[PDB]
Amino acid sequence: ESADLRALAKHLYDSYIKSFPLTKAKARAILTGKTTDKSPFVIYDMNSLMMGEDKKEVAIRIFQGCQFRSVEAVQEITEYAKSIPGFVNLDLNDQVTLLKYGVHEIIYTMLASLMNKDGVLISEGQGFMTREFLKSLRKPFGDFMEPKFEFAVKFNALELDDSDLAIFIAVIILSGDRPGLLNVKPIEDIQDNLLQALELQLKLNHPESSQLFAKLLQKMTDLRQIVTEHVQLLQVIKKTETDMSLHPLLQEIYKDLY
Template identity: 55%
Template structure:
């Protein structure tokens, strides 16, 4: 991957010292839960990394999911849609719950699961609080357009009055320096308007990818991961994180751009010709539901960190190491939400569900981008984004 996505690599000694252990793989065996390729015999059944991590996270964090009586069919393509039915299927197929059925489980894993049933110690809580504060501080110093700042602008509480872009004329005015610092040489640009909006979306994405790479480096534990795994986590995680943070810049009428200096109306984006009119509309639909959760910047910092450190990304050399780091972040997020949202007991599992929604949103976005590349000869793709999308889905 290009230089922007290459965090600092651990030393050869670190990589060879066992920081990332070996992953045992079971060949030609399907996961009993979702049908994906099983990675081993986990908690009593053959399971994939995704279902293993889901079950372990449910146990460790004592999660309770909203009831569902539809008996949803759990498959690889939809396994993240209904957490209640997925967990019930884990139990019905023999994965242990309260009385852990250890079977062939390694001793280290057995000790870790026994530890789940013990109360959280004061020192552990203190460590999670410190982790939350460290990630929040890094998030606020890395990203200038925070949710707090964006909501102040969108609700008129800020002294910033964004320039409204609602048609072709106002877009070209914005390009003349009213909104964007990067001035175009042509006036108006020689490209068709839909292609130009696609270009602007890419500019913003590239800037955010670079910021997310810096943020990832600051997450405790990230620098200990294999360099190849760091790149894989960023490749698959940056767009999920981008669309999560993008929701903070949106309301039902449009979105802020250029650090709040501009506001592009939703109707203008809808008015673009096919396929460009489909670029942003799914993001607005996601944002309306995501913003209803009323997360603050400290919540979002931990959520974005958890998105990046996702242990079921394809091609990871040591997924269990990534899972361990993510679960610590998720534990910190769960504790933090209990404090910041005491009246929303289901907020944490809802956020885990939003991770699945973001993954689907990115899949659809990647398909649209690849379609635009094939059908629109004048719509080029930034090299960094090309590298991210290559072999992604």
């Protein structure tokens, strides 16, 4: 029923606030300068990057920075998943599978919140790295962020807020079609209810946004292609940048992925 769907929506929003210290609302306030005493440090070149260290080669430093950020996000997203009703009762192997296949899709969703066409917030919003600086990085590091910016500009045009995002993220995590899932039915049942909640949320929160629900569902499929592309890049780096290795948590996620 409708009241149940709204209580679910609100529960997910509350869990989202509890799990993710930097929200889209906060990020947008920083990006448009509608905040008090906190104007972010801009990284646009090598010298800019040097100055921002107080507050290896350049491309590796950036790469390793994304990795540390990524492991923090994995921890936050796991804490969020555990508050999705029904999730912690799933077979624990299926929870691992859901997390393994869903976590990067969520990371790139939430990255969009921190992005505009010109760059991305770093260091909990204390810094801003330009899209152009990231593009300047040597092969094969210079192309890693471009598909994420491309996605973000179009995704951000949908004007979703944190309350919409909380349900969106939950729907993605509870995907019954991940490889290796033992018990698909209970996952699909939870996702079905989350989808109803999302549909009602989008209708009430954005009544005049045409076919918003359909548009959002398509974005979920687009996210998988972004992950695919990123994984391909990571295999290039593993093969040809042999001195390096991923953080152990990231190694675990990427091992036997697809």
